[PDB]
Amino acid sequence: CQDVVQDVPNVDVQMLELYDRMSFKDIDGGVWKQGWNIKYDPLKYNAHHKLKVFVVPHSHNDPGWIQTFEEYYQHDTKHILSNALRHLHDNPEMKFIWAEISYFARFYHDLGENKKLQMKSIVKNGQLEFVTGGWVMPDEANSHWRNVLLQLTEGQTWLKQFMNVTPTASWAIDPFGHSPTMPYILQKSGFKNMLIQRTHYSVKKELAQQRQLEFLWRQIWDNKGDTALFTHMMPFYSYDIPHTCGPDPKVCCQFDFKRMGSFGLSCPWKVPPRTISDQNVAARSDLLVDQWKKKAELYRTNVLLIPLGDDFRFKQNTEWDVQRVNYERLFEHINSQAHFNVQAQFGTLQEYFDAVHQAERAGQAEFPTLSGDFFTYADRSDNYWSGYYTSRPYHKRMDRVLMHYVRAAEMLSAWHSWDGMARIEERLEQARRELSLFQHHDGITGTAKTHVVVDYEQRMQEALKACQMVMQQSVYRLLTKPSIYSPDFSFSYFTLDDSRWPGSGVEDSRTTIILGEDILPSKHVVMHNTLPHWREQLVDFYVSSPFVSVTDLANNPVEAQVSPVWSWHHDTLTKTIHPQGSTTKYRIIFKARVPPMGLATYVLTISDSKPEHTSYASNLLLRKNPTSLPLGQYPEDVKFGDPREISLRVGNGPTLAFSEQGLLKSIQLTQDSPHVPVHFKFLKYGVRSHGDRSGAYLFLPNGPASPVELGQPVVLVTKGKLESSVSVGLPSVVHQTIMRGGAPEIRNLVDIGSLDNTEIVMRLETHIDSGDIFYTDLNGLQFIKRRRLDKLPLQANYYPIPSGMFIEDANTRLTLLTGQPLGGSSLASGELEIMQDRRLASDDERGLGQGVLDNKPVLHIYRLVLEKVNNCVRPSKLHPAGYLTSAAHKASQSLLDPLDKFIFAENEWIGAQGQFGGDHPSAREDLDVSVMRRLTKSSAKTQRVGYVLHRTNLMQCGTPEEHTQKLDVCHLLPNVARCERTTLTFLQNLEHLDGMVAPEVCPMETAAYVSSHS
């Protein structure tokens, strides 16, 4: 295993280092506005060294954006695909590439057999080529790597099954900025090449000058280079035709033959395309070839890629004809005029890369190595696309909840083979596809129109329901004596209970367990732990009485705590935001201990008075002018007081001190240690009154944020033996700090209401001497070093915070982990900030045609980990990566993959069992079974189960951390006959494993294994 901490990789281009050096000046470079006047030597190409040009026809299809997926399919895409099938069938030399398998599958299943056969034929013969082959072209900023893998697998599995092909070249022309998580996953999924387009215009200029637009992209910690994937970065401002034939859009636009009038399109540079004729072909070719030779100067080989396409192009048969015929006339003339020394033809993306590597193998070019990312993107001037790291935060949070529910549903149902009547495969397929669709670069990004966001939400809601059905059926089967197990595959044996989604104050969705001497004395509940190690976590349930005790299934008492159910209200009468306690229901909380990838059953039993092992939280409402807060049967009366500073300590955990406004002010790790200044503060950014306006994509603040005026907020303190918390009703946010004995959990119920042109940010102020350095993660997979650059505007220093960020000095680190992707930064030494929501009244000129005014209450969650790190073995100053501590990684896991909770839905569960998985190996804490998925239906003689195993890398800070068992996923199910290491999508076997043992993987590595069983 490579050491991913101590050796700084030697690469030709390291993006953080490049950023430190680059000046980013936005100077007018001429017709190539963001470049320079490219010059070339006409003698470079000649009879024995021609410029091979591949014109690659494409059609960018967004699976939802201005219309919903189905609306675009009906109005545009089904015509594009039907006409592509006809045109390619009839014109054997025409080519076309396709990326979005969600649309292709939607089309294909509506085709009759004759057409399906014609389609397989043009794919088999190389005319129609799939690029990437993912369900969508995903966002790369907010997406979790697990969902990027999920959607890639969904599309490639469909392609293998129905088209018998697996793309090895990736095409990503629209994500707003690019992540190295893509080559990481692609290279482990059989890919050999990838192409990207949206990178900062300054970076395109810089790499173009050095002919470094094509590079071997390796991971920031990869010293050896085995993660390397050849990447082609396009050079220009757009993937449209005006910005893909060469440097001058006024000339290239003339070669987009769909812009002549009858299609309602034109060239904004005021020179329209002209039909190619025998009389003008030489002059048109003179112009086109000159553009091509200028573009070729920016690369190292004599093979040139010329994309030919735009949004939803190649729709009408007349469009196919006008593009094809005019280009064929140009090719016939150009390839017969020896003086151009050009051979041009339509080609596919793989054809291009194959020729490039033939040139490379012939010793004609060597490519530079590069590590780093391409965030934050700006397409022009100071227009940085950091707004979408936060836009539509409700759905960004929903993405993470469904991410976890899909994993749990697939894992819980994988243990058994199911009868087709159970509809398990059907429900899981729907769930995987709706989540996969939302990874689209206008889905999770929050950049779609309002009715499209609603469509994604409805689809994810149906996916969550499908997951719940599968999980509850699976739990009943896993924990019921087999000879008693009697399933009704449509029956609800259990109801899932989720404390954080949609969340208290967002939707009243949780069921109350109704107990009573006259109706039901007790209730079984079950917890599932999807992680491959024993895990304890506090869980809560709503109950109809505060006098409830908990036992495990051996009837052993389990210590519990009961707290009231508090809900906050913006009281339009008193004009205060204050809490009301329920008089009909209460929260029971206790520590559940669950086996690795297993289940554990507990029982809640009512009693007539306080039970021996249940304690009751005290509650204190701090506010001027209080009124009573009756709590029905709750045994402790609420206390009141004027606002004041308070301190709390749960267990042996940290002691936290709060200001009289209910916000954290300091953390003291142990009773003897210092009260470290750590202060939460809420601020707001506005929008510019002159010039460019922030919108769904762009963050264009009118200067640094201003503090939210807090008034004298109402603060509620609940103190319990197992859990305490401080909650405060601030304008737009009910802010809560919860303590369970370790790093606190922060929950913000964010309701931006009608505050137009406002972005609400949550900032942490410390005295940590971080200077201009901070760390943020990429897709929940790795942490990358960031350096705040004052030569760049505020919005450029904002980065995606898909799951965590931290600052540190030589001795102290503060890590903030998130349960949802949001945008954030460290704008000054000692600070961290992360945006909660943004409401924008204007459109930002990127095509959406609306601002963001559809905000709704969202419950954001976090873990805040303050740690001493002077004893940790950290990377050197020049290393571009950072790594979490064990506590911060576990904290992240508690937000993203919490225990699942199930309430038995009927009165009596006959045949109930206490635990499942007690014999599963408890793997080392840095290892995770990211995916467990049965790959065969029940009629398959040989069953197959796939596993994706990921090992992160955690800092060695002196904790002995020991004794764990090796996890061999191939032996998790009985009767194993074979164990194979496969690509991450499970589509190709890479290694037959001895003894049918799946070895564990190295730090920062991810492997896939498939076990076969008789």
Ligand SMILES: *[C@H]1O[C@H](CO)[C@@H](O)[C@H](O)[C@H]1NC(C)=O
């Ligand atoms: C398609 O995949 C390869 C062709 O390169 C080969 O296995 C066979 O011809 C096809 N597979 C099928 C249809 O089973």
Ligand SMILES: OC[C@H]1CN[C@@H](O)[C@@H](O)[C@@H]1O
């Ligand atoms: O300007 C951004 C838009 C451009 N390309 C389209 O296909 C959209 O997905 C993008 O959101």
Ligand SMILES: [Zn+2]
């Ligand atoms: Zn797009």
